[PDB]
Amino acid sequence: MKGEPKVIERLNEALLLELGAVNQYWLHYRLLNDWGYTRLAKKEREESIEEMHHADKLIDRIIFLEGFPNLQTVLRIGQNVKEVLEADLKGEYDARASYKESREICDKLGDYVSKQLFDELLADEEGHIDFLETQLDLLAKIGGERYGQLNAAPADEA
Amino acid sequence: MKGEPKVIERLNEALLLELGAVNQYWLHYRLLNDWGYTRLAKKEREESIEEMHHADKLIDRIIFLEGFPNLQTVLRIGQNVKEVLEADLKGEYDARASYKESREICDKLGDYVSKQLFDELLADEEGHIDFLETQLDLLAKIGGERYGQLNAAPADEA
Amino acid sequence: MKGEPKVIERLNEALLLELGAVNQYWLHYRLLNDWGYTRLAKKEREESIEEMHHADKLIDRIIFLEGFPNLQTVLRIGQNVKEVLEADLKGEYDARASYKESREICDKLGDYVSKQLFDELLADEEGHIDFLETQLDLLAKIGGERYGQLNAAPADEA
Amino acid sequence: MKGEPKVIERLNEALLLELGAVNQYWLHYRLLNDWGYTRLAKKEREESIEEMHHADKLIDRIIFLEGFPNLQTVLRIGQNVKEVLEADLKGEYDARASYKESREICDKLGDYVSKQLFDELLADEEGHIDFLETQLDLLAKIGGERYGQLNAAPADEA
Amino acid sequence: MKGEPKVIERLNEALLLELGAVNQYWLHYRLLNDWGYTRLAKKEREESIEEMHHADKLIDRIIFLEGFPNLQTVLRIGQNVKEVLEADLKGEYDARASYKESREICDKLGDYVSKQLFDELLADEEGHIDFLETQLDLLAKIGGERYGQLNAAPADEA
Amino acid sequence: MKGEPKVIERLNEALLLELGAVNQYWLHYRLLNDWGYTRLAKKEREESIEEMHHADKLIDRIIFLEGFPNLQTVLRIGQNVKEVLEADLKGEYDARASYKESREICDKLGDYVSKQLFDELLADEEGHIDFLETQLDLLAKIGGERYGQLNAAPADEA
Amino acid sequence: MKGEPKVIERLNEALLLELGAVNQYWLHYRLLNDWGYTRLAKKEREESIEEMHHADKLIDRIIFLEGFPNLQTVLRIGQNVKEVLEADLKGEYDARASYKESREICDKLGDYVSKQLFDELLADEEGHIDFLETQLDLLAKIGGERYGQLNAAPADEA
Numbered sequence A, B, C, D, E, F, G: 001m002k003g004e005p006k007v008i009e010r011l012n013e014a015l016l017l018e019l020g021a022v023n024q025y026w027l028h029y030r031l032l033n034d035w036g037y038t039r040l041a042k043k044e045r046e047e048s049i050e051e052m053h054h055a056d057k058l059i060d061r062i063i064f065l066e067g068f069p070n071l072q073t074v075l076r077i078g079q080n081v082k083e084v085l086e087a088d089l090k091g092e093y094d095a096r097a098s099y100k101e102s103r104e105i106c107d108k109l110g111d112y113v114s115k116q117l118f119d120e121l122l123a124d125e126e127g128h129i130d131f132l133e134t135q136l137d138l139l140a141k142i143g144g145e146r147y148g149q150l151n152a153a154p155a156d157e158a
Ligand code: HEM
Pocket: A019, A022, A023, A026, A049, A052, A053, A055, A056, A071, B019, B022, B023, B026, B049, B052, B053, B055, B056
């Protein structure tokens, strides 16, 4: 199905955001692991792998529409566990805004199946945002050192 | 262990090559799948996931040496199955050359464990090269259409 | 829920297309089987049975809306395996266009659950189109005789 | 049982042929594998291991007869799959002729158990010849590229 | 294989370091257990047993080279959990430096298998260093009392 | 329980003897293994590990009594299997004498639980002495070469 | 990867040594079995099969480097069990020396993966040497007739 160039453009913008999130979550996984926060690190790895699946779905849709997926292009880091979470959350807010605009563009152009892809991604993103906002609320309430302790394993495990 | 800046630089050059290979193999997986070469597509996916593990090991070593992993940066595509294989092979030859030079640099600077990482990557790469050269030899001998047929599934499978 | 006559009309147009696809895929199953392409034949049977389920869902929705399902009414055939695939693909493009227009009509009339039915059918159809386009691309690349061979079983199986 | 020198000589001629066949089949296994004909390669490996068992039986008989097994001594190669098969077949015809003459010599000298060893080897050899002649007939009938394709695995297997 | 006296000397220096580490880790296990840090204590026991295996491998290599293993000779203690970890880390840095120099000496003298032993020990040591540095980083970030709590069991377990 | 300095001194003398026995038995294990007496070697390894457990119990008791365990300090070797056994036996006789004197000192000072530890060690030691005396008696009766043969494995095992 | 001619030459020298060891160990297996030393015979068979795997790895590397493996070319025998072991040991010392020189040549020419192959073979060889030296030490200590008895089975087994 030869797709609308503007739809392919929006799918490629999403792909760039998702690839950036893959890399950011993976770097956060390895950073948190080195700091000793091995339980939060495992969650960050899982979040990276979820974004990998999103990137795969975007690539598949772009190829179906006979467009060219742009992976050649792809970061917010952080010096403590609060900054890492905040950086992830900023990324998710940015992706959410992109997908909201993209579903509107696909709807107006009549590509309702691409619209549906963006609707699914948007729902996913609000789930991720809910999770991260809750973690940052917990960190605020119990303090960063107890949040870190809660998200670390004893020495005989990891 | 605060690492030599030149060693961290070589690890980051490897990371850029590996991230590029992840993306190239994944794009090839989805492209080959859309063309109907679903068996070769599955191998390309597996090759991408192997390069993901290499990238992970490089990131881990960079962080141990107290360097900054550069993922912000990352392609050869192809219009038929021979060109896809050739593009993968060119990438592997380029990576091999990088790792050979890197093991020599780590050896001269006395970072023998980073040397060992590059030695492992080099052995891996020559394995990958052996595989791809064999596939291209088979394609040469039986022709591209029979090679494609061999690497496609019937309609009731995939 | 007494439905809009225009919505029931669009559901009946979909039912006619789906019943036509059931019959076409089933005839293709038996034709391909007689020609010896028993693996593609099995896929065509499966595609017919998928369209039977779609027809069932349309009938159920029409009856819920207190309309009369029109089954009394229901073809593109083909002389070789490429023509069979092309005929299936033309049918799918026609159905896709019908469902796109139907979801728009249901949306404008405020029957959002019927809209959702058409959205699901539209997504299904684009999946079917993706599959058939890939098979026709493979046939183009490896040639029709190798595509047929790939989709045939040896004599000791079927 | 102190054996006839002429019988020990014939057993040593067989051992030299068998050791040569071990080496030739093993080299063919690795060559075919590198060319991508991994299914025929596996058969060549199995044929090499069968010849290893024959060599073992010859060594055992020579030692029983209080002779000295000569292994210090041991090739036809090939540039394509037809030449490889032809080289194996020429070797088998040569071995068959040796074993026929050897059974006659053992019979005339009254070493009926060594005669029996050569009779078994001769029957084995005619089995091997039957197999190889059939493969070369198939290659002749379907052509070398289809024979190679039939004897190659897709990329996601080997 | 009668070994180079200088190689045997370096193997004996490693053995003395490893035996010292066995004793230090075991004393730390019992000390930490008495203080109530039973989870970190279990890790220290495991680390002692890993060093016992290293000592065994060194003794085996010395005997193969027809040298005399010197076990007759063998400590940093600590008053709190941070000091215990720091003492272990200082020991590991000292061992790493010894093994780096030893691999260079074996390489220059042409004892490449002893070189390989030291290369393995060096890689092990950098793993141990990575672990201990991470534990000390965690302790720094969450504080010593939370690190101790994390590494202690409730009264109904240990 | 703050212990008597004289009791802690006797526990530390026992620890020094036990650590010496660990090292001696382990060296004997590796020596006997290299000579080919692999069955006696396995027993010597087991004896070393038993002495490791004794050392652990001594360290635990010293720490309970708020003393400082001295591991910083720790040999009789042997050129044939009789000398190895004799060296082990001399060590056991020395340890037995130490533990006998130590139980008497603990009894007189009123540390009856430390007395009990030495009583257990003394009973253990007389068991070890019984075993070693029996092995040396067997060696005397059947001769050293048959004793060695009995305590060696064939080449296809170890 | 088109290899250095000097590297291919060293790989072929190793192949000739390994093929010679295969044959020597196999002949020793059958000889020892006929003499009644069936347990040592089984070990010699296992050693032959280990050398077969080494030869296979060498052939694979030569073909990858686009060289020609030379198998056309390939012995120390022995009249008693001590001479058989001594002949095996002389072969291993010769192979070790070859592999040491070969790893140095590959290193200087920059073929680090072939260097690694020779490093692995060298470590293997020193293991084999350790085993054989231990067997010859045992034979020296208990005498040849007891060593033979230890390595023979009773009549109701083999
Ligand atoms: C184009 C970009 C990428 C795509 C499309 C992608 C896709 C995937 C997919 C589909 C999986 C399978 C997950 C599952 O089975 O549930 C996966 C796993 C994984 N990914 Fe990625 N990935 C990408 C980039 C990366 C990067 C940059 C890394 C950095 C290390 C990475 C590391 C991993 C690892 C370690 C696994 C697990 C593999 C295993 O369990 O054996 N990936 N990826």
